[PDB]
Ligand binder design. Structure first.
Ligand SMILES: CC(=O)N[C@H]1[C@H]([C@H](O)[C@H](O)CO)O[C@](O)(C(=O)O)C[C@@H]1O
Ligand SMILES: [Cl-]
Ligand SMILES: [Cl-]
Ligand SMILES: [Cs+]
Ligand SMILES: [Cs+]
Length: 308
């Protein structure tokens, strides 16, 4: 009521992201004694993630989600977070961001250059590929009309495996799939469930190509105005919500394959060696474009042990 704040997201009301944001909103309201109320704006009501990041910068939106990789729009080396097959697991994603020089620098720059404060990081699933025909091997990708988000790294995944990428906003995907304007898409299993893409896709291939994190971000214009006791409430609530957010994704990844099979989806397990070898020229291109900053980030990440 004193602070009527807004949290925008691309995800919808059935999603894990929305569930975690609800938990965050409820904890902030309770622990602030009602001084802060957070309203949720799902389903790209305020724009996509690129638009909502701009709104955080300007101070017209208070909170939003982004992947670490999405900062490639400003810092090309940050694409390293979404180079296909580079980041093996969430353990690596966490250490890449918080425990490398490159990641620490990125967090500083988001605050200083972009006016956003990183509150917490969660896991947001590993992307897989759905389609209207079976993907039994890399050969089946050739010429497949694959929807991707408006992001360079996803476009590259599609191009380098031989598909024909079609960029479009998340909100447009169900209808594109329903009408077969595209042949498939790619997203974590949880998003396939939340958006009901299983109603309009018969096949799911475990391509395991890009791992997504999720950052809880606040606008500096809003965070700086909170008394420090309320800043702590927001920070602590974001870290609690991120743990819950991660749990939701980890649990679903165990169970969701079975759910899809019961819904009539056929699951394939193509040999991933040719998918990985197909990305080698893209890694080369990334280093050529981003120079020593990129080569260095890639080496810092490749050094991380994936085992807990
Ligand atoms: C934080 C956020 O908005 N994530 C969104 C991502 C990123 O926009 C994309 O991976 C580029 O970073 O795209 C989706 O997976 C998608 O459109 O399929 C929806 C998801 O909600
Ligand atoms: Cl083909
Ligand atoms: Cl189906
Ligand atoms: Cs279809
Ligand atoms: Cs303050």
């Amino acid at each position: 009521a004193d602070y009527d704040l807004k949290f925008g997201m691309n995800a919808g009301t059935s999603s894990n992201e929305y569930k975690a944001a609800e938990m965050f909103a409820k904890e902030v309201k309770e622990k602030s004694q009602g001084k802060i109320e957070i309203s949720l704006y799902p389903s790209s009501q305020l724009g996509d993630d690129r638009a909502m990041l701009k709104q955080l910068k300007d101070g017209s939106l208070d909170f939003t989600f982004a992947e670490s990789a999405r900062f490639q729009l400003f810092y090309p080396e940050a694409a390293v977070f979404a180079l296909p097959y580079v980041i093996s697991n969430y353990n690596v994603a966490q250490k890449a961001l918080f425990d490398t020089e490159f990641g620490k620098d990125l967090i500083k720059k988001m605050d200083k250059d972009l006016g956003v404060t990183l509150l917490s990081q969660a896991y947001n699933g590993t992307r897989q590929t759905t389609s209207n025909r079976a993907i039994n091997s890399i050969a089946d990708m050739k010429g497949l009309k694959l929807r991707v988000p408006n992001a360079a790294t996803n476009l590259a995944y599609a191009k380098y495996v031989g598909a024909s990428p079609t960029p479009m906003a998340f909100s447009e995907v169900y209808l594109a799939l329903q009408t077969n304007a595209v042949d498939g898409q790619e997203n974590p299993l949880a998003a396939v469930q939340a958006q009901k893409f299983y109603e309009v896709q018969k096949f799911l291939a475990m391509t395991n190509h890009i791992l997504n994190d999720q950052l809880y971000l606040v606008s500096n214009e809003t965070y700086k105005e909170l008394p420090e006791d309320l800043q702590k409430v927001v920070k602590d609530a974001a870290e609690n919500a991120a743990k819950y957010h991660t749990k939701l994704f980890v649990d679903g990844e165990k169970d969701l394959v079975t759910f899809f099979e019961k819904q009539g989806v056929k699951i394939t397990h193509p040999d991933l060696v040719p998918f990985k070898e197909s990305m080698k020229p893209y890694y080369a291109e990334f280093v050529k474009q981003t120079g020593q900053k990129g080569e260095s980030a890639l080496k810092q990440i490749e050094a991380i042990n994936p085992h807990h």
